[PDB]
Ligand binder design. Structure first.
Ligand SMILES: Nc1ncnc2c([C@@H]3O[C@H](CO)[C@@H](O)[C@H]3O)n[nH]c12
Ligand SMILES: Nc1ncnc2c([C@@H]3O[C@H](CO)[C@@H](O)[C@H]3O)n[nH]c12
Lengths: 230, 230
C-alpha cells in the first residue's frame, strides 16, 4: 500500500531516524546501506547514500529498483544562500537544478544536462504536506530552489558564482538534484527536507562541523513528522 | 560464463555495435535502453546511458544489477587535452578522475569525492588487451588519464583550468568517471575505449558536430575487436 524511501548521505544524517524504526533489517548492496522497517506506522526504507552526485544516483536507483517506493524524501544538511536563513533552519525543495553543469556550448540553459529538463520539480502534494508539518512542529523553515554540485561551497567566491547564476537559489548541497534526476527517470515523486548546517561561505567548513548535529535534529524531526502524515 | 557490458551516451555512439548483434532484444527501464545479444561470439548488453554523471550512474547501476556483467566497456567521444592527438584517435583509459569535484575545504584532493578514492583504475588486463587490439587494427591510439565532469569543455579557458589541475590528463568527457565510480562500488572491472571528436577548445562544439561519426567508427571498431578477444 505505501512505501516511503528516505535518503541521506552520511551516517549522522540518518542515525536518528534509523534508531526510531521498529522491525529493523539491514541490507547492503555495493556501498549502499538500507534499513527497512516501520516509522510512525508507515513502511520506510532508510538509505545512507554516500556523498555527491554519483553516490546519490546509485543509491536512489537501487532504492527504487529493490524496494519500489511510492515517494522519496531526501534529508541531510545544506549551505544557506538566502541571507535570512540561520543554522538549523529547515529547507524544503520546490525545484532543484545543478549549479555546476555547463553545456551552454550546445545552446542548453546553464545548469541543464543535455537532453534533460532545466530543473526537476518536487511533488507539490509533498511540499504542501511538509509545509504544514514544520509549522505545527514550530520549526523555522523555508521552501525554495535548491541547487546541487559535486563541490562543497566553502568560500564567498564560490557562493557569489552560484548567486549570480541562480538569484533565487535558497540553498546548496551535493545530492538533491542527482536524486531528483533519478526520480525523474523512474517517475517517482520526491521532496527534499534538509536543514542549514552552514552559510556556504569562508566559515562553511567550520560551521558544518559545528552544526552537523543540530541540522540532523531539525531535518529528522520534520521528516519523522511528515512520514506520520503520509 | 562471460557477459560484457558496453555503455555509450548517445544513439550515434552505440548504433554501429547494436546493428552487429545477433539474437537482439531490446529492454527499457527508466530512460535506459538495453540491447542484449551476441557480438563476435560473445554475450553482450549494449547500453545507451544518456549524457552526464547521473545518467551514466543510473545506467551502470541497472546494467550491473540486471545483467551481472563480468566486465564493462565505456565507449563514445571525448575532447583531446594531449596536443599530439587528432580527431578519430582512439582513447584508452588508465585512471580516471573528476575535474570538477571540489571538496578541498575538508582536506580532500582536488577532484576527489568525499570518502571516495582520488581516482578510479581501469582493469590492467583490459588495458593490455585493447592495446594489442588497436595496434592490430592499425588505429592511432593512446592510453592515459581521462577526466570527467558535468560540463562540455568548449573553450580554451575551461581547457586550461583542467590542464593546470591535471597536467597528465589526456582527454575529457562527461561519463567515464561516473561509470568507473559505479563499477568501483560494485567491484566490476572496467575500461574506457572512446575516440577524439574535438580538441576541447573554442571550436569544440563545431568539431564535435563534424566528427561525431568519425569518432563512433574508430571507437566502435576497437570495441568490436576487443570483445572478440575476451
Ligand atoms: N555549503 C555546502 N556546500 C555543499 N554541500 C554542503 C552540505 C552537504 O553535506 C555534505 C558535505 O560534503 C554533502 O552531502 C552535502 O550534500 N552541507 N553544506 C554544504
Ligand atoms: N570536449 C568535450 N567536453 C566534454 N564532453 C565531451 C564529449 C562527450 O560527448 C557528449 C557531449 O555532451 C558527452 O557524452 C561527453 O561524454 N565529447 N567531447 C567533449
Amino acid at each position: 500500500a505505501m512505501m516511503i524511501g528516505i535518503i541521506g548521505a552520511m551516517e549522522e544524517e540518518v542515525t536518528i531516524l534509523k534508531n526510531k524504526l521498529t522491525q529493523l533489517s539491514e541490507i547492503s548492496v555495493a556501498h549502499v546501506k538500507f534499513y527497512t522497517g516501520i516509522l510512525k506506522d508507515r513502511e520506510v526504507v532508510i538509505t545512507q547514500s554516500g556523498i555527491g552526485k554519483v553516490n546519490a544516483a546509485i543509491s536512489t536507483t537501487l532504492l527504487i529498483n529493490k524496494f519500489k517506493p511510492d515517494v522519496i524524501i531526501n534529508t541531510g544538511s545544506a549551505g544557506a544562500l538566502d541571507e535570512s536563513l540561520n543554522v538549523g533552519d529547515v529547507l524544503i525543495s520546490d525545484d532543484v537544478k545543478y549549479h555546476d553543469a555547463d553545456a551552454t556550448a550546445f545552446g542548453y540553459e546553464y545548469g541543464q544536462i543535455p537532453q534533460m529538463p532545466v530543473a526537476f520539480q518536487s511533488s507539490k502534494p509533498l511540499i504542501e504536506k511538509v509545509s504544514q508539518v514544520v509549522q505545527q512542529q514550530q520549526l523555522t523553515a523555508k521552501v525554495g530552489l535548491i541547487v546541487s554540485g559535486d563541490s562543497f561551497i566553502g568560500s564567498v567566491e564560490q557562493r557569489q558564482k552560484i548567486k549570480k547564476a541562480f538569484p533565487n537559489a535558497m540553498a546548496v548541497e551535493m545530492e538533491a538534484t542527482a536524486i531528483a534526476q533519478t526520480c525523474y527517470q523512474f517517475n517517482v515523486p520526491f521532496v527534499v527536507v534538509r536543514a542549514v548546517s552552514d552559510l556556504a561561505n569562508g566559515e562553511a567548513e567550520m560551521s558544518f562541523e559545528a552544526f552537523l548535529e543540530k541540522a540532523a535534529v531539525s531535518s529528522s524531526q520534520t521528516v519523522e513528522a511528515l512520514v506520520s502524515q503520509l
